């Protein structure tokens, strides 16, 4: 037997950081969940009980807190690059660090029309994430994403013209509900190291904002021929707006809302043009994925 | 053996309804999860296998859809009163209906600064709920609530002066983080029946809005001496603003964020006045409850 | 405004305890989640910011650990009685303690046919719970329960003879699947205090075992006319077997498995007597409740 | 812009199947959740709104039910191979099918010491899974797994000798609790097609059973030097026992149970040799992974 691949570390490390402007009194909070997995010359911990090569996962947890104390935690693309670089520079036998960060929303409260200096609201479960892989000699690969963005439009979605055979019961339609939970990932070009990541810092927040805006506008305005077609249009625009992105991936469930035929009850009309009451379906659901890159 | 209490019905009935203004093109969606449990002269279904007294739970599900087709679904206090009244009027041997409604957020999207006519976003997991108990001869009792409103303030929360004995390790503090998931319930005065509920329809949305506003402002502005003290002030204001409410109940977890002592590492200062990085605790949590009524 | 009711404490306190027999080498583990809420003369913490009446929730957490160190944690009915008695005896102004305990399964592993001395498996998510209310001057009220016991039978369940009207579409049936998650609660007669609870210690484990056995046998052997009828038979037997129980309550979802008509595809027969493939429904579900007591 | 990768299908398809022996009266149930994603020449559905290349996801759902009606659903490795082969053979432009199956436990009840003919219990949340990738011209790749197997041992776990530096606070230990949720995957050698899979049918259930047995025995009997070391020993044995497996992967969380120092309270001794009461930690957790293959 041989170890073909090994990685280990600390998952589900919850971190909060507060920034206090002494000038203005204004406080800003950041809350994340962090995962760090390491690889390197660690095979003997598995094969020979040799713990001397193990940086304890508890020590990894400590490091995350220390790094957050001494560095900015935003944008998470920078924080994660700093964190991963740390492990491969500090430990000679560690050659890769895999850092995943989930950012939780704490949005400043408006009270009486004015931004409150130190109160916040979790205004939805949408997340901003990063995956950062720091590999000794091979630079820094960053995948940024948004997830848990739940949307619905009540009309201007169509689905017709699909393949019909002896397994098909689905009726063509020119007017349906479309609802999904958006998972969108943009993959940056490889960066040579931390100096290069630092050089692009302003692009990370801006690109996140553009991706969200494009997603929302396109969903709302597209007279959609299918989930496939709509999602392609989203990906095409993001790539057009940020040249340092190599690929954009979307993964979208099609969360079905079914018509309910009530005609058995006193001839009540609740289908097609007369559909007002629908049954949301918890399962099953369509799942549609696409990765779009440059020609 | 005797049946001392019995109730039965359909839970987790998901319902969507759309309203279409043909004038303006504007669509509005409502999505709920509904539970209906019935009581009455049904003991023999349990004791004698006599199913003749059972209105099938499947029929209850059908009724919910039919009622939603033929009536307004908002405010949920009205919808639930209509639904419960239906069962006790229609079936001679059914004498109580217990209706629980959870309303899910579908907030109209702003695209380019303009309200979109038919696209929506789930802008958080906060819910608006109602519990309606319709009892033959005893009217309609309505409890309205908001839940899942998650908030945090980074300062202006204190906790000092509490009882100290040989079980106490907690240090007094003059500056801490306060974070909670708000569950707030207001109980209306008993209504004689549907005509009376209809007569008060405008008060339901207005009171929900006031309760939310009061909760948020009070949390943000109170230099809090304890969760207990802050929540009392919220309840006092709601009761003052709506005379048709008899009681207000709050149930608030105290979701702890712990300081992390980093002084073992190079003398790093991260406690008291120097606290910047904290560890959110998933469990355990304080749980603080209060019911406030009129003197 | 006046405080009509108030309670506060610590929820979600996870506790593990190990017992080591030095004779035999055999270890036994117990794992619980505990909630303790207190009531008494504490209104001024809410109304006047008077924290002097508050036993901090952190201190409540400490107490739970200390009590578990110094006392047996099984049966949970005894542990919870000891814990609640502590608070009302120790603090003059605390007059009620409400203790909820959820016991998690750690079942000893069989390796090579022999019981292992110190390895355990979580052999399902079924829980054994207790709710203990200790009220100064009014003794100790104990509700014991099992929950999360998920069962299914593939035949010998019928549902016919129910009320049919213009809201009914459900077809009568003589052969269906029946599946549920059992929640069963037995309420003990009031106990005068801790000495009395101690006097009945052997009955707690025995009654839990009987309730589970009766539930399982009755479900498996009853040619069920309805959930209502089957659950009544379970409750009747428990009450017959343990005289110190006053009431038994069951709450049972009816988790539907629907036939799938495949006849549109090449005349495939998959309904009634020919039903082999079914669609489990996640929602909605029937919910059936009964409380049975003594005549 | 170009489509670099695309896949789509139906997720969360819940399926139940019953087998009835008319001889003996004995019924056996199977319950799964199935996901099928397809790839092929479908780019134009995304880029040109050309739905003619789409086999509707609703039709995929129908197919799953039809296939389950006409074929055995066990072992899931066979069912998934049949299902995936179907799509690539039936549709000329579909060239890959990705089939994921989660099998849920329905274990026959023992009532009075005898196996019941048609009643079942969900005896834990452990799953048996398969991932089957059927690729036109490249055969059938099957990954089998077990997941959600939760275990704990109260002693005979050690962790000492690890790297200590200025980020390390963790104390070496010779006696700790070890608890994990086992996720174990075995990857079969590529199969040329369905005839070859059929030829190995008996090996699938047998290998699943061996993997579970080896996992459980090794966990219980190993005087563990680390999670890394213990998991390696599990993987080595599986590979030794089944030659048609190419790799074994384990992913194991280290779910921490912390000592609680109670010495501040009346000198109570609850650490090291005197540790009886521990605090289970919900987060963070160690995460340890290994892929082991043949030399
Ligand atoms: O947008 C859609 N894409 C699909 O592939 C599909 N299949 N069924 N319904 C569908 N709707
Ligand atoms: O606001 C608070 N109330 C309490 O009762 C308490 N106990 N510990 N900490 C606390 N904070
Ligand atoms: O056992 C049942 N009880 C009910 O009350 C019911 N209603 N529909 N189906 C049902 N099955
Ligand atoms: O078994 C373990 N492996 C590890 O890598 C580790 N790190 N901390 N604790 C640990 N325990
Ligand atoms: Cl779909
Ligand atoms: Cl608290
Ligand atoms: Cl039902
Ligand atoms: Cl670990
Ligand atoms: Na290195
Ligand atoms: Na009536
Ligand atoms: Na007292
Ligand atoms: Na093909």
**Contact (CB<8Å) B293/C1:** yes
**CB half-sphere exposure, A77, CA atoms < 13 A:** 30
Q: Chain D contacts of B282, Cβ < 8 Å?
A: 282-283
Asked if C35 contacts C91 with a C-beta cutoff of 8 angstroms, the reply is: no
Q: Do A3 and D290 touch (CB under 8 A)?
A: yes
Nearest to C212 by CA among C292, C286, C291, C148: C148
How is residue D258 written in tokens? 């912390």
* Burial class of residue B122, CB neighbours in 10 A (0-12, 13-18, 19+): buried
Resolution of the experimental model in angstroms, please? 1.9
Point out which residues pair with B127 in neighbouring strands: B147
Bridge partners, residue A277, by sequence = B17
Shortest Cα distance, chain C CAs vs residue A278, angstroms: 14
Give CA–CA dist C281/C277, Å, rounded: 13
The three state secondary structure string of chain A is: CEEEEEEEEEEEEEEEEEEECCCCCCEEEEEEEEEEEEEECCHHHHHCCCHHHCECHHHHHHHHHHHHHHCCCCCHHHHHHHHHHHHHHHCCCEEEEEEEEEEECCEEEEECCEEEEEEEECCCCCEEEEEEEEECCCEEEEEEEEEEEEEEECCCECECCCECCCCCCCCCECCCCEEEEEEEEEEECCECCHHHHHHCHHHHHHHHHHHHHHHHHHHHHCCECCHHHHHHHHHHHHHHHCCCEEEEEEEEEECCEEECCCCCCCCCCCCHHHCCEEEECCCCEEEEEEEEECC
| Rounded (5°) CA angle D62-D68-D74 | 150
Check: CB of residue C134 under 8 Å from CB of residue C143.
no
Please state the separation of Cα C102 from the chain's center in Å.
8
Q: Closest by alpha carbon to D277, among A61, C25, C79?
A: C79
Which of B185, B4, B213 is closest to B100 using CA atoms?
A: B185
**B37 with A240: CB under 8 angstroms?**
no
What is the C-alpha to C-alpha distance for residues D144 and A152, in angstroms, rounded to an integer? 37
Residues sharing a CB contact under 8 Å with residue A202, sequence separation 6 or more, in sequence order: none
Closest by CA to C97, choosing from C49, C55, C145, C45, is: C55
Q: Which residues of B are catalytic?
A: 10, 57, 256
| Residues 234 through 273 of chain B touching chain D, CB cutoff 8 Å | 264-266
Whether B228 has a binding-site annotation, put simply, is: yes
Give the residue from D45, D83, D31, D89 showing the smallest Cα distance to D62: D83
Cβ proximity of C166 and B63 under 8 Å:
no
3-state secondary structure labels for all residues of chain C = CEEEEEEEEEEEEEEEEEEECCCCCCEEEEEEEEEEEEEECCHHHHHCCCHHHCECHHHHHHHHHHHHHHCCCCCHHHHHHHHHHHHHHHCCCEEEEEEEEEEECCEEEEECCEEEEEEEECCCCCEEEEEEEEECCCEEEEEEEEEEEEEEECCCECECCCECCCCCCCCCECCCCEEEEEEEEEEECCECCHHHHHHCHHHHHHHHHHHHHHHHHHHHHCCECCHHHHHHHHHHHHHHHCCCEEEEEEEEEECCEEECCCCCCCCCCCCHHHCCEEEECCCCEEEEEEEEECC
**Main-chain phi, psi angles of D114, to 5 degrees:** -115, 135
Contact A123 B123 (CB under 8 A): yes
Q: Are D266 and A22 in contact (CB under 8 A)?
A: no
Classified as helix, coil or strand, D284 is coil
The residue among D122, D151, D158, D264 with the most chain C CBs within 10 A of its CB, best to mutate, is D122
Burial code (b: 16+ CB inside 10 Å, e: under 16) for A255-283 equals bbbebbebeebeebebeeeebbbbbbbbb
* Residue B270 annotated as binding site: no
Report the distance separating Cα A36 and Cα B255, nearest Å.
25
Backbone angles phi, psi at B259, to 5 degrees: -60, 150
Q: Which residues surround ligand 8, an ion (CB under 5 A)?
A: A 57; D 254, 286
Residue C283 is nearest to which of A169, A266, A282, comparing CB atoms? A282
Distance CA D18, CA D23 (A): 15
Contact C248, C185 (CB under 8 A): yes
Task: Please report residues of C whose CB lies closer than 8 A to that of D15.
Answer: 277-280
CA-nearest of A230, A224, A293, A229 to D44 is A229
Report the alpha-carbon distance of residue B230 to residue B221 in Å, rounded: 10
Separation in Å, CA C16 to CA C29, C104, C264, D249: 7, 10, 56, 30
Q: Would you give the DSSP letter of residue D174? A: S
Count CB atoms within 10 A of the CB of residue D263.
11
Pair B104, B146: CB distance under 8 Å:
no
Instruction: Supply φ then ψ for residue B260, to 5 degrees.
Output: -120, 115
Region of D92 on the Ramachandran plot (φ > 0 left; ψ -120 to 50 alpha; else beta): alpha
Alpha-carbon span D139 to D81, nearest angstrom: 10
CA dihedral (A81, A85, A87, A90) positive or negative: negative
End-to-end CA separation in angstroms for chain D: 43
Cα pseudo-dihedral A103, A109, A115, A119, rounded to 10: -80
**Ligand that comes closest to the CA of residue A8:** 4
Contact between D251 and D231 (Cβ < 8 Å): no
| Method by which the model was determined | X-ray
Q: C245: exposed, middle or buried (C-beta count within 10 Å: 0-12, 13-18, 19+)?
A: buried
The 3-state secondary structure of chain B reads CEEEEEEEEEEEEEEEEEEECCCCCCEEEEEEEEEEEEEECCHHHHHCCCHHHCECHHHHHHHHHHHHHHCCCCCHHHHHHHHHHHHHHHCCCEEEEEEEEEEECCEEEEECCEEEEEEEECCCCCEEEEEEEEECCCEEEEEEEEEEEEEEECCCECECCCECCCCCCCCCECCCCEEEEEEEEEEECCECCHHHHHHCHHHHHHHHHHHHHHHHHHHHHCCECCHHHHHHHHHHHHHHHCCCEEEEEEEEEECCEEECCCCCCCCCCCCHHHCCEEEECCCCEEEEEEEEECC
Longest distance between any two alpha carbons in chain B, whole Å: 78
Conformation bin of residue A219: beta by default, left when phi > 0, alpha when psi is -120 to 50: alpha
Three-state DSSP at D198 gives helix
Whose CA is closest to A268, among B36, B71, C283?
B71
Can you tell me the distance from the alpha carbon of B121 to that of A3, in angstroms, rounded to the nearest whole number? 47
For ligand 10, an ion, list residues with CB under 5 A: B 88, 94
A265 contact residues in C (CB cutoff 8 A): 166-167
Phi, psi at D261, each rounded to 5°: -80, 115
Is there a catalytic annotation at residue C256?
yes
Cα–Cα distance between C60 and C99 in angstroms, integer?
11
**Does the CB of C171 have a partner CB in chain A at under 8 Å?**
no
CA gap A239, A223 in Å, rounded: 21
Cα A242 vs. chain centroid, distance in angstroms?
Answer: 17
Q: Which candidate, B19, B25, B111, B127, places its Cα nearest to that of B74?
A: B19
Distance CA C190, CA A2 (A): 64
Residue B259 bridge partners (DSSP)? B278
User: What does the DSSP 8-state code read for residue D269?
Assistant: -
A270: left (phi over 0), alpha (psi -120 to 50) or beta: alpha
Domain B1-295 is of which CATH architecture? Roll (3.10)
Residue in C166, C167, C264 closest to A169 by CB: C264
Cβ contact, residue pair A124, B120, below 8 Å: no
> Per-domain residue ranges for chain D?
1-295
Subunits with 3+ Cβ pairs within 8 Å of B are A, C, D
Give which of D217, D277, D279, D282 to mutate to test C binding, by max C Cβ within 10 Å. Answer: D277
Q: CB count, 10 Å around CB of D23?
A: 6
Verify whether ligand 3 is closer than 6 Å to residue C237 (CB atom).
Answer: no
- Cα dihedral across residues A173, A177, A182, A187: positive or negative: positive
Please classify residue D150 by burial: count the beta carbons closer than 10 Å to its beta carbon, then call 0-12 exposed, 13-18 middle and 19+ buried: buried
Closest CA to D286 of B149, A38, B114: A38
What tokens were used for B223? 């230099």
């Amino acid at each position: 037997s041989a170890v073909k691949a090994a990685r280990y570390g600390k998952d589900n490390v919850r971190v909060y950081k507060v920034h206090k402007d002494e000038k203005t009194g204004v406080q800003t909070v950041y809350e994340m969940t962090v995962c760090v997995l390491l690889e390197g010359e660690i095979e003997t911990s598995y094969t020979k009980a040799d713990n001397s090569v193990i940086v304890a996962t508890d020590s990894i947890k400590n490091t995350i807190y220390i790094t957050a104390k001494q560095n900015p935690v935003t944008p998470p693309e920078l924080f994660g690059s700093i964190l991963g670089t740390h492990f491969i520079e500090k430990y000679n036998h560690i050659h890769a660090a895999h850092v995943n960060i989930v950012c939780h929303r704490w949005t400043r409260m408006d009270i009486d029309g004015k931004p409150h200096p130190h109160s916040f609201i979790r205004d939805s479960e949408e997340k901003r994430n990063v995956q950062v892989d720091v590999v000794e000699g091979k630079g820094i690969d960053i995948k940024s994403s948004l997830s848990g963005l739940t949307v619905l439009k009540s009309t201007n979605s169509q689905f017709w013209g699909f393949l019909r055979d002896e397994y098909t019961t689905l009726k063509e339609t020119w007017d349906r509900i479309l609802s999904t939970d958006v998972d969108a990932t943009w993959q940056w070009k490889n960066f040579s190291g931390l100096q290069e990541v630092r050089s692009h810092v302003p692009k990370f927040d801006a690109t996140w904002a553009t991706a969200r805006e494009v997603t929302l506008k396109t969903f709302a305005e597209d007279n959609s021929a299918s989930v496939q077609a709509t999602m392609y249009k989203m990906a095409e625009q993001i790539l057009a707006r940020q040249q340092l992105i190599e690929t954009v991936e979307y993964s979208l469930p099609n969360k079905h809302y079914f018509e309910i035929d009530l005609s058995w009850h006193k001839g009540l009309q609740n289908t097609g043009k007369n559909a007002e009451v629908f049954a949301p379906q918890s399962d099953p659901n369509g799942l549609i994925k696409c990765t779009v890159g440059r020609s």
